[PDB]
Amino acid sequence: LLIRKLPFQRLVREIAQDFKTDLRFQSSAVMALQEASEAYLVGLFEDTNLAAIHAKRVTIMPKDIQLARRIRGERA
Amino acid sequence: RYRPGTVALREIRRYQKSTELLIRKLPFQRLVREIAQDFKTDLRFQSSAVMALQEASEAYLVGLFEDTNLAAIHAKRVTIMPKDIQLARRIRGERA
Amino acid sequence: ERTRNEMTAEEKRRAHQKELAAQLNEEAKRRLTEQKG
Amino acid sequence: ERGFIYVHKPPVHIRFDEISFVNFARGTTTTRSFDFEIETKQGTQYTFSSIEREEYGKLFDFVNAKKLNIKNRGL
Amino acid sequence: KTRSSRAGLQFPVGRVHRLLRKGNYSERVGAGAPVYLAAVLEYLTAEILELAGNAARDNKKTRIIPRHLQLAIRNDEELNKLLGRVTIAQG
Amino acid sequence: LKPKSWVRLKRGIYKDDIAQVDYVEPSQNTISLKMIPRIDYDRIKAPPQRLFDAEKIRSLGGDVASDGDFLIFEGNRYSRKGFLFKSFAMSAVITEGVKPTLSELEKF
Amino acid sequence: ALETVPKDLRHLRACLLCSLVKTIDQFEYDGCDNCDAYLQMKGNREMVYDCTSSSFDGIIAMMSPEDSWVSKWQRVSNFKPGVYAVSVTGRLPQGIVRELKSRGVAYKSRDTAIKT
Amino acid sequence: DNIQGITKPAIRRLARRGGVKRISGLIYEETRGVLKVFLENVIRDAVTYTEHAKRKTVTAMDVVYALKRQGRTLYGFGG
Amino acid sequence: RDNIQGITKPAIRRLARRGGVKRISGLIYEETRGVLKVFLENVIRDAVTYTEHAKRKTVTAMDVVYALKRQGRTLYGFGG
Amino acid sequence: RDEKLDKKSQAMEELKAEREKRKNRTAELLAK
Amino acid sequence: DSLVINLNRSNPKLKDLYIRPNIAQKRMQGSLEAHVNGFRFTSVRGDKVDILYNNIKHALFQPCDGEMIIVLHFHLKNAIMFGKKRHTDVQFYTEVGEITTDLDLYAEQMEREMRHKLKTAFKNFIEKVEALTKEELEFEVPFRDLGFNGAPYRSTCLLQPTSSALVNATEWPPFVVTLDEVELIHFERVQFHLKNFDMVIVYKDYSKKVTMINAIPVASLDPIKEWLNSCDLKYTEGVQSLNWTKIMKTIVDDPEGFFEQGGWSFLEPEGEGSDAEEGDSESEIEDETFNPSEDDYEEEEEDSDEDYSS
Amino acid sequence: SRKESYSVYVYKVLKQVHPDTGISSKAMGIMNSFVNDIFERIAGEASRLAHYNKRSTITSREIQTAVRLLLPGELAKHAVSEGTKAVTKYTSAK
Ligand SMILES: [Zn+2]
């Protein structure tokens, strides 16, 4: 656990709004999301550090994340 | 310039609506048989299966080189070095 | 049926691009034939 | 067989005798991957990052076979 | 009338249904499943083929070729996504 | 050893000039302080008190370092509007016995 | 055992729940002997800055919590033998206190000092 | 605007957890962007599975499917 | 002649040039073969896996097709 | 769909508008 | 010839400015002022750097929107000496925030303020200069949603179009393409199986090399064409990537015969019925244009009418 | 064995959209391949939904979900549309 549960839930309900009103989430789902959310960012940062390493740097940059996701095929 | 080398190769870019296999089919087919043999004997290889593998691998290796180029580019390098292939494979997570 | 969103962006653009190709070749020939000196 | 050596630049050599303690931190490859910590008796610390979960067990088996002190061995 | 012809569809609904029944997708299969599915197939098929014939025109041809399908899928932002990692085989 | 109050100074030439805390790192070891610089401006070589802001110091030379409205100058004279935000060890400054009261209300 | 005692005298800080006193690096390295399975203050420094406090007063050596007065006055009779601070200042976030409460862990501040 | 609510330290702590040594402030802008894109797809899928189940409040069962369907699968649960 | 060299450096050089890769270390060509072999090995294994259910002792494009699917390399241009 | 297309088209329109301004301006001032 | 400092006038100015490239071995701050006929950047160490307004091929302004720096990019018609080196490209910028964090509203808000503050100050400097310059130096602002990922030199960056150029000034070295000089564009490696592609720029003076913009992602294919279309830029696609140095000398040596062979039409993928080569190089593949034989249709009657429950 | 295919109907549809156009066996093979691929993607996903219900039977309802999940934007709108039309078209009897 590393993000504040409120802003996280607020964001979940907020984006839910863009798809559909009425939507709210049982605690189990929002927790499961954060549980998934953290795992994804963890993996991505590890990967990004591999790029950092590969680029002979320690200060990661967005392009490191971009490349990692780019190579990962996260985008369309 | 109407002379050869100019016309064909220039136009071949446009004549090349074809999808010519980049690895030599027989040199590759032999390797298929070879690796196939490495797995198991009695394996008849349909040319269709040979083509299926060949075409997939060529695009696939080109794919690998897409990532490898990125990673070279990533490292501010033009020449790819095996570390890039490795980086790419590691990041793709497409490792055995 | 007839579910396509709209004419493809290329089809619209094609006339202008095709146009540009003609324009380009004429334009290219003078500039370049003139530049050849 | 009797030490650890980091090959190529910066080249560095380690002997099991110079090791104070080491540990396989939760690494950078997977939640079960590892990074290897080393601190020398000289107080000089070395750490090797980003290593697959697969190499965790082998190095885990290896250091116990070398019987060196691992920070998490008391766990 | 064939189930397809009931639906006026070209697609063989019995085949789609038969594929699912024998294909181990489920223990039983209701008619609405293959019916909806067969219609969807013709729709996307037409969606592509519509572009393909257009591409054929855009290729000076009355004969569609694989080369035309490549232009369709990459120019169509949806097929571009639906067929994003797919491989087309051709000598 | 805790932040957020208005206090009195003890050591150096920086004797008893009142300040407050600006922003907090959780370690509770030191307190950041809204202070007035005591520099000579690095000019005797090629003691005082005067608030100074990173500008005539730039003609003598030295470290001019801006962090926007937050500044650093001539050897980490952490300064803003000519005031130091350098932190002091909470024991080294006399912190207690101020308590902002009805009469006190306007300084910081 | 003595692993709970300051190994080094540099930068000592006290756990803020059970007031156990250890070095900046001992908490970073080892965590709290009575609350790591309950606190998880081990391995990180931002966490150290939050949980482990530099503001503590006096030290108490626990020898026989079962038969001792100081063991009672200091709220340590339920701990293992070690050195604890008489009073540590500060307070925990509005989350872990609830997590602790959920487990039946009642956070009472070790802050024995009277305020002015 | 709650993506702005995903605190820099929260992200920062995950980066430390991912062994990153250093970070450039743009990572926050970028990290928030990444978080949205992941969330957008997971929720849309979560929404759709819930929509199919004829419900308006999402359950862990539904999110498991949304992640599992994307290969981003969660662990520790059964039924 | 040994088929591992059958994936000649120029055959590789063509693919890398197509993967947009410009200069190529000699070292690459060798790893490419390994990668390709690793790639093929996984694929062929699966093709055989399919072939065994079919009680066949002949490898078909169908097995490869059914295999490339399973690896996220779905292939069009085969079957009926 | 239309919102992002409009955002992109808008950037394109602005570009087109600015190009035209510059086109008209460039010819006029040099023409003088 | 000079610069002529606009003495005793309210010469617009900006002060949080890092010049790029550095004059000396290491970077310096300074302030940029607009004068009678050019700019001047004066370092905090007293160095003077002057830019005639005319010698500026382009003035492009990069707001710090999504960028850790606010930048004024100068693309020059001629290179100028920084003493150490000569450069056709120059920048003035300043850091937006913490770039070197080693592992909150006030800080975050100060970022919002500081950006706006700087953003405004620069925006004001621009307007003051545009007014001063009789607008002869309109600061093109890169149309960010019209930018795309690519690599003009060595590293991946977001290329962005401006009213008259395609550039990426965030990174260094700076990338600037004056669209006035673009003869043609070719999208090499464009193919369905690729995930990325490349772009080549042909210049109007063929004595100068083409420029590549490697590995641009294919998802940007249609948007880039459209941008190019809107710029009146002719482009062409090609799965192949043949030698431009050869193609240039070829056409440089014999442009007459080149144009006679339809010139640049050689890149045309023969999409639509250009009468000159109406039949391209095509032939029937090996098929009878898939025509299902009369006997294959007959199995349809077993679509047995079982009214399986809705 | 007797070969199975959709190429017949693909051509019928080709003519239904472009009667004036024909197609080569390779392009036909691609389209026929596509039919097989997409059918299984949806067939698998429709099975998972039925499986999540812990049920023996799959319906159009699972399809609508799977279609919206697998098909992007427009394709989902139209597949919902054309699919709803096609359902209705052989629903009117009973
Ligand atoms: Zn404790």
Numbering used by the authors:
A (entry chain e): 61 to 136
B (entry chain a): 41 to 136
C (entry chain j): 462 to 498
D (entry chain k): 356 to 430
E (entry chain g): 16 to 106
F (entry chain Z): 273 to 318, 335 to 396
G (entry chain Y): 2 to 117
H (entry chain f): 25 to 103
Publication excerpt:
We stalled the complex at a position that is known to trigger nucleosome transfer upstream of the Pol II (bp 64 of a modified Widom 601 sequence). We obtained a reconstruction that showed Pol II at a resolution of 2.85 Å. Focused classification of density upstream of Pol II revealed a FACT-bound hexasome and SETD2 bound to SPT6. In State 1, FACT binds the transferred hexasome in the region of upstream DNA above the Pol II active center cleft. Approximately 20 bp of DNA covers the histones from SHL − 0.5 to SHL + 1.5. FACT is bound to all histones and the DNA, covering a total of ~5200 Å2 in buried surface area. Elongation factors DSIF (SPT4/SPT5) and SPT6 are well positioned to stabilize the FACT-bound upstream hexasome. Based on CXL-MS data, we placed residues 266–315 of RTF1 into helical density on the surface of SPT16. In State 1, the catalytic SET domain is occluded from binding the hexasome by the presence of FACT. SETD2 is now poised for methylation, but FACT occludes the catalytic SET domain from binding.
The deposition of H3K36me3 occurs co-transcriptionally when the methyltransferase SETD2 associates with RNA polymerase II. The deposition of H3K36me3 is carried out by the conserved histone methyltransferase SETD251. Here we present three cryo-EM structures of SETD2 bound to RNA polymerase II elongation complexes at different states of nucleosome passage. Together with functional probing, our results suggest a 3-step mechanism of transcription-coupled H3K36me3 deposition.
